[PDB]
PDB file of C-alpha atoms in Angstrom:
ATOM      1  CA  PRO B  18      -0.521 -12.353  11.277  1.00 36.59           C
ATOM      2  CA  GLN B  19      -1.535  -9.098   9.592  1.00 39.21           C
ATOM      3  CA  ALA B  20       1.176  -9.510   6.932  1.00 38.58           C
ATOM      4  CA  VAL B  21       3.355 -12.202   5.360  1.00 37.89           C
ATOM      5  CA  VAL B  22       6.841 -12.045   3.828  1.00 34.49           C
ATOM      6  CA  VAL B  23       7.244 -13.869   0.502  1.00 34.43           C
ATOM      7  CA  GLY B  24       9.641 -14.024  -2.430  1.00 32.63           C
ATOM      8  CA  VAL B  25       8.239 -12.731  -5.743  1.00 30.58           C
ATOM      9  CA  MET B  26       9.853 -13.833  -9.020  1.00 29.17           C
ATOM     10  CA  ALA B  27      10.044 -11.348 -11.881  1.00 26.12           C
ATOM     11  CA  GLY B  28      11.258 -11.062 -15.465  1.00 28.07           C
ATOM     12  CA  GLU B  29      14.205 -13.156 -16.618  1.00 26.89           C
ATOM     13  CA  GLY B  30      14.850 -14.299 -13.031  1.00 27.33           C
ATOM     14  CA  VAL B  31      15.235 -11.651 -10.281  1.00 25.81           C
ATOM     15  CA  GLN B  32      13.826 -12.778  -6.912  1.00 27.37           C
ATOM     16  CA  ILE B  33      12.686  -9.994  -4.546  1.00 25.41           C
ATOM     17  CA  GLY B  34      11.682 -10.409  -0.890  1.00 24.45           C
ATOM     18  CA  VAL B  35       8.456  -8.531  -0.039  1.00 26.08           C
ATOM     19  CA  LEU B  36       6.082  -8.173   2.941  1.00 22.30           C
ATOM     20  CA  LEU B  37       2.520  -8.449   1.587  1.00 21.06           C
ATOM     21  CA  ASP B  38      -0.835  -7.659   3.196  1.00 22.36           C
ATOM     22  CA  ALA B  39      -2.217 -10.996   4.389  1.00 22.13           C
ATOM     23  CA  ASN B  40      -5.952 -10.191   4.035  1.00 21.60           C
ATOM     24  CA  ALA B  41      -6.551  -7.874   1.058  1.00 21.55           C
ATOM     25  CA  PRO B  42      -7.721  -9.687  -2.102  1.00 20.62           C
ATOM     26  CA  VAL B  43      -4.926 -10.555  -4.542  1.00 21.96           C
ATOM     27  CA  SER B  44      -6.332  -8.483  -7.417  1.00 21.46           C
ATOM     28  CA  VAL B  45      -5.690  -5.308  -5.369  1.00 22.98           C
ATOM     29  CA  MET B  46      -1.886  -5.859  -5.118  1.00 22.82           C
ATOM     30  CA  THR B  47      -0.664  -6.993  -8.586  1.00 24.38           C
ATOM     31  CA  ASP B  48      -0.513  -3.489 -10.125  1.00 22.38           C
ATOM     32  CA  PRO B  49       1.495  -1.625  -7.436  1.00 22.27           C
ATOM     33  CA  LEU B  50       3.543  -4.803  -6.949  1.00 22.03           C
ATOM     34  CA  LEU B  51       4.541  -4.648 -10.636  1.00 22.14           C
TER      35      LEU B  51
ATOM     36  CA  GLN O  19      -2.023  21.411  -5.206  1.00 24.99           C
ATOM     37  CA  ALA O  20      -3.440  18.111  -3.935  1.00 26.75           C
ATOM     38  CA  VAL O  21      -3.537  14.367  -4.587  1.00 27.80           C
ATOM     39  CA  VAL O  22      -6.024  11.516  -4.064  1.00 30.35           C
ATOM     40  CA  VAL O  23      -4.902   7.985  -3.154  1.00 35.77           C
ATOM     41  CA  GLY O  24      -6.367   4.635  -2.117  1.00 37.92           C
ATOM     42  CA  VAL O  25      -5.466   4.038   1.538  1.00 38.90           C
ATOM     43  CA  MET O  26      -5.800   0.420   2.695  1.00 36.20           C
ATOM     44  CA  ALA O  27      -6.815  -0.271   6.299  1.00 39.28           C
ATOM     45  CA  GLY O  28      -7.980  -3.081   8.603  1.00 40.13           C
ATOM     46  CA  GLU O  29      -8.474  -6.550   7.132  1.00 38.55           C
ATOM     47  CA  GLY O  30      -7.692  -4.908   3.781  1.00 36.82           C
ATOM     48  CA  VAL O  31     -10.651  -2.508   3.557  1.00 35.59           C
ATOM     49  CA  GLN O  32     -10.126  -0.053   0.680  1.00 33.99           C
ATOM     50  CA  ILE O  33     -10.561   3.657   1.516  1.00 33.54           C
ATOM     51  CA  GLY O  34     -10.088   6.776  -0.641  1.00 36.63           C
ATOM     52  CA  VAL O  35      -8.543   9.975   0.736  1.00 37.86           C
ATOM     53  CA  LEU O  36      -7.400  13.430  -0.417  1.00 41.26           C
ATOM     54  CA  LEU O  37      -3.938  14.590   0.723  1.00 44.36           C
ATOM     55  CA  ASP O  38      -1.795  17.687   0.308  1.00 41.98           C
ATOM     56  CA  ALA O  39       0.997  17.642  -2.264  1.00 43.48           C
ATOM     57  CA  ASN O  40       3.730  19.532  -0.345  1.00 42.58           C
ATOM     58  CA  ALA O  41       3.168  18.864   3.386  1.00 39.15           C
ATOM     59  CA  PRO O  42       5.344  16.021   4.738  1.00 38.06           C
ATOM     60  CA  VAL O  43       3.893  12.616   5.551  1.00 40.77           C
ATOM     61  CA  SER O  44       4.607  12.946   9.299  1.00 41.95           C
ATOM     62  CA  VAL O  45       2.311  15.975   9.747  1.00 45.82           C
ATOM     63  CA  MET O  46      -0.553  14.159   7.964  1.00 43.88           C
ATOM     64  CA  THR O  47      -0.272  10.524   9.152  1.00 42.31           C
ATOM     65  CA  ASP O  48      -1.710  11.529  12.552  1.00 41.15           C
ATOM     66  CA  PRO O  49      -4.914  13.323  11.397  1.00 40.89           C
ATOM     67  CA  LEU O  50      -5.273  10.739   8.608  1.00 44.27           C
ATOM     68  CA  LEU O  51      -5.364   7.969  11.239  1.00 40.53           C
TER      69      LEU O  51
END
């Protein structure tokens, strides 16, 4: 339960499967995720 | 040479740490923990 796997959609349509931290606040992840 | 990075830990708590530039990750992940 410490992490969750989700599909992130990016420019023009590429879908990428990623394992994100389930409890950190969302504003902390958008930059390195990009 | 050195570097400083934001190391995330339990429940997402943000922590800042200073690490060496040339030593490999394996020799530092233990003392860092």
